């Protein structure tokens, strides 16, 4: 399969409660493997996957150092942001970053990422060409102008094409039996009378990995986008995902309706009809 | 493998 590594960091200021809280997490696909919490006693990059525990001591000493350096830079970034937006230093503000890389089956670089959000909205992102920046407002295009002068893109591009794919390829080879798997969704429908003349038909997908999945209702093979309820895909807590989709249906019309399930772990998409 | 040099905004 094709694979991704994502590093996510959140800095939240809290004036008159000391220095910004910083929390960072790392994923390969939908599997978390590390975390750092600047309020924890450890002050370390901690394993959050049994399989990463195999990395040698250099790995943990170095990863701790880098994320701590990040914590310090994103602290200063909260302040720079405060200046750009002309905002008081009484308010709590949130700075969010995501970087990482994708590889294909062969292990070859596919795509890099490097993006920030201030107070919950896009601030700046590296474009998919890796040579320039999308600035989202007047404040971000100060950063964009500064980063184009400093050549941050071709430097971060060197990390995304290098250390980032190397990391990913090593996690894929050391976490093999966890990460190079698909669990296909286990699918069933439930009929739920609402009135003597109505029912909710609920389409279930359980125990699937990875998280990405499409659940669709049709009626005579027309999509029911408008009248379908659909829950966010949710974690089971055991490294699998759950989802459902529901349509309210006239009593008697049940067999006009089909549920379509697409997922990377299915040979061909599933069609389900209220048969049982 | 984390970055070794985060940029300033």
């Amino acid at each position, epitope marked *: 399969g094709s694979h991704s590594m994502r590093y996510f960091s959140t800095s939240v200021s809290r004036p008159g409660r000391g220095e910004p809280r910083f929390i960072a997490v790392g994923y390969v696909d939908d599997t978390q493997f590390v975390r750092f919490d600047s309020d924890a006693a450890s002050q370390r990059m901690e394993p959050r996957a049994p399989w990463i525990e195999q990395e040698g001591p250099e790995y943990w000493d170095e990863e701790t*150092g*880098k994320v*701590k*350096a*990040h914590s*310090q*830079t994103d*602290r*200063e970034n909260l*302040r720079i942001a405060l200046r750009y937006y002309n905002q008081s230093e009484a308010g709590s503000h949130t700075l969010q970053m995501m970087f990482g890389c994708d590889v294909g089956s062969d292990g070859r670089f596919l795509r890099g990422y490097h993006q920030y959000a201030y107070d919950g909205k896009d601030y700046i992102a590296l474009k998919e060409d890796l040579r320039s920046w999308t600035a989202a407002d007047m404040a971000a295009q100060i950063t964009k102008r*500064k*980063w184009e*002068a*400093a*050549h*941050v893109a*071709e*430097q971060q*591009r*060197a*990390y995304l*094409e*290098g*250390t980032c794919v190397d990391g990913l390829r090593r996690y894929l080879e050391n976490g093999k039996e966890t990460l190079q798997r698909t669990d296909p969704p286990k699918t069933h429908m439930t009929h739920h009378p609402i009135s003597d003349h109505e029912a909710t038909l609920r389409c279930w997908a359980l125990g699937f990995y990875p998280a990405e999945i499409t659940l669709t209702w049709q009626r005579d093979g027309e999509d029911q986008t408008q009248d379908t309820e659909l829950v966010e895909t949710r974690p089971a807590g055991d490294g699998t995902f759950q989802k459902w989709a529901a349509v309210v249906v006239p009593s008697g019309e049940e067999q006009r309706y089909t549920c379509h399930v697409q997922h990377e772990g299915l040979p061909k998409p599933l069609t389900l009809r209220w048969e049982p | *493998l984390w970055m*070794r*040099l985060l*940029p*300033l905004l």
Partner: T-cell receptor
Amino acid sequence: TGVSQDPRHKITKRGQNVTFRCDPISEHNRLYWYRQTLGQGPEFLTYFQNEAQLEKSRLLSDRFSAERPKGSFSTLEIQRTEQGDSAMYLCASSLHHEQYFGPGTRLTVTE
Amino acid sequence: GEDVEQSLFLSVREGDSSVINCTYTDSSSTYLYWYKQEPGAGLQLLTYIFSNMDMKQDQRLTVLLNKKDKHLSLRIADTQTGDSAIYFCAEPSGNTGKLIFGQGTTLQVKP
């Protein structure tokens, strides 16, 4: 255009205090102090990210004391100067990763 | 771990190729620097390469990089007497971009 340092040359008496200024390129957030001896590559002394002094070498005795009070110009202080403190004191600034160096401060401590 | 290793001296004939060689410490370093110093002070940033490039050329200068073996080399096309100086290869160390330097290759150009 480049980084600026004052003075270009200092000669103090041994056991006296001395102070150099560094003025980085306008709006450069990152400031590095290095030490160079004739015949050698420069050696890291300290790192400022605006105001914050984020990383300092164990080549600094307690006597060595750098400030960047306003995230602007930096000062380095040596208390009770010794013969062994004779060197070029280099300042460099970058926006990210490209470090630009000053003309240094050549220090000589004589008895 | 280790240091940045380069030769202290290299002699060339005016008009011959100069190759200056360097081994650096950490394969993850995203950029590598060549600095040059002439009589007096003044570390001049001469050229740089990112770790995702095999090669970079800039007039009479050429930089070749081997990331796996951590070999960096400055090649000078048409060495003039004016090219006589000390060349340092410099690598970012740790999680700022503080530089560690080679000991410097003094370049002597014979008429």
